[PDB]
Amino acid sequence: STISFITWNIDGLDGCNLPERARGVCSCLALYSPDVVFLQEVIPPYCAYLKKRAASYTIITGNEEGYFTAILLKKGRVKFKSQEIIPFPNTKMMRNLLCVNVSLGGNEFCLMTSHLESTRGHSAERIRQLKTVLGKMQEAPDSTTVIFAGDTNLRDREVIKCGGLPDNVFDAWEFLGKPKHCQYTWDTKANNNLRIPAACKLRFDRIFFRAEEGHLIPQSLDLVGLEKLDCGRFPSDHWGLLCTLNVVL
Ligand SMILES: N#Cc1ccc2cc3c(=O)[nH]c(=O)nc-3n(-c3cccc(-c4nnn[nH]4)c3)c2c1
Ligand SMILES: [Mg+2]
């Protein structure tokens, strides 16, 4: 029993080299062939690109106002059961939590994604949204494997300020012993898409899981989208995260 997935803020609001960058992301999906893809900052022409160049993935969306999140399900592997949209009532950037209940490899899952409140100034709202996500993860039925993968925009001690991760929720990067090779997902030194002159390295993209003891645990975690495209830029200002969870008995 296993699940492989990619989480990626694909910077859809960047109108520069968007078809080439979308091609780049679809090439990654074809190469790594994940069961599920969690995407953030998707825009309408980006969906149209995914429909043609990643046609074997069912695109699940909630609200599609401006830019939004999506959960892609591999056709034939993942069976869609239901979707739930959890609002962030105090969001100023139309952010929300999207859960998609699915069946995969004989196991039941609630796959969640969000793009938590952006900007340093809205730290208090981002922390409240993280609490909502963590609360929803704990509320899922006991026999279901809960996976959150998204752009949290988290930094410093914001997780500590939220009250920390609960006793039954784990960060995949933390669980694997905080490996250095995938410690930053938003790196202005290694990534040139935004042309930020200052060197900034943050871990905005995070994976949280809630699984039964002795069942699914992270096997691997790797950065994706580190290959420069023909235009000399990367598919996004963010690196994507490729993760596999496996059962260890
Ligand atoms: N350009 C640029 C630029 C350069 C350097 C940094 C450095 C940090 C840092 O060491 N810690 C941190 O928590 N955030 C940093 N951001 C950041 C990243 C996203 C958003 C906002 C932000 N939004 N609104 N105001 N600031 C700041 C940067 C951004
Ligand atoms: Mg962006």
Author numbering: 122 to 370
Pull verbatim passages from the article behind this deposition.
We therefore created the expression construct m2hTDP2CAT (m2h=mouse-‘to’-human) by mutating the following mouse residues to their human equivalent: E242G, Q278R, Y321C and H323L. The m2hTDP2CAT protein retained full phosphodiesterase activity, and consistent with our prediction that the resistance of the mouse protein to deazaflavins was due to the variant M7-motif, this activity in m2hTDP2CAT was inhibited by 163. We were able to validate our approach, by determining the X-ray crystal structure of m2hTDPCAT bound to 163, at a resolution of 1.8 Å. Superposition of the low-resolution hTDP2CAT and high-resolution m2hTDP2CAT structures in complex with 163, confirms that the binding site is conserved across both proteins. However, the higher resolution data obtained with the m2hTDP2CAT surrogate, allows a far more detailed characterization of the interaction of the inhibitor with the TDP2 catalytic domain. The guanidinium head group of Arg276 (all numbering is for the mouse protein, the equivalent in human is calculated by subtraction of 10) is involved in an extensive hydrogen-bond network, including both carbonyl and nitrogen groups of the 163 pyrimido-dione ring, as well as the backbone carbonyl and side chain (via a water molecule) of Asp277. As in the fully human protein, amino acids of the M7-motif coalesce to form the ‘hydrophobic-shelf’, which permits extensive van der Waals interactions with the tricyclic deazaflavin core; these residues include Trp307, Ile317, Ala319, Cys321 (text in italics represent a ‘humanized’ amino acid residue), Leu323 and Phe325. The tetrazole R1 substituent of 163, is directed towards solvent, but packs against the carbon-atoms of the Arg241 side chain, providing additional van der Waals interactions.
Tyrosyl-DNA phosphodiesterase 2 (TDP2) {also known as TRAF and TNF receptor-associated gene (TTRAP) or ETS1-associated protein II (EAPII) } is a 5′-tyrosyl DNA phosphodiesterase that can remove the covalently-attached abortive complexes generated by DNA topoisomerase II (TOP2) when it is unable to complete its normal catalytic cycle. Fortunately, this type of DNA lesion is efficiently repaired, in part though the action of TDP2, which hydrolyses the phosphotyrosyl bond in a magnesium cofactor-dependent reaction, leaving ligatable 5′-phosphate moieties. Consequently, TDP2 has attracted interest as a target for small molecule inhibitors that might have utility in overcoming innate or acquired resistance to TOP2 poisons. Using a ‘humanized’ mouse TDP2 expression construct, we have now determined X-ray crystal structures of the catalytic domain of TDP2 in complex with deazaflavin inhibitors, revealing the unusual molecular interactions underpinning their mode of action.
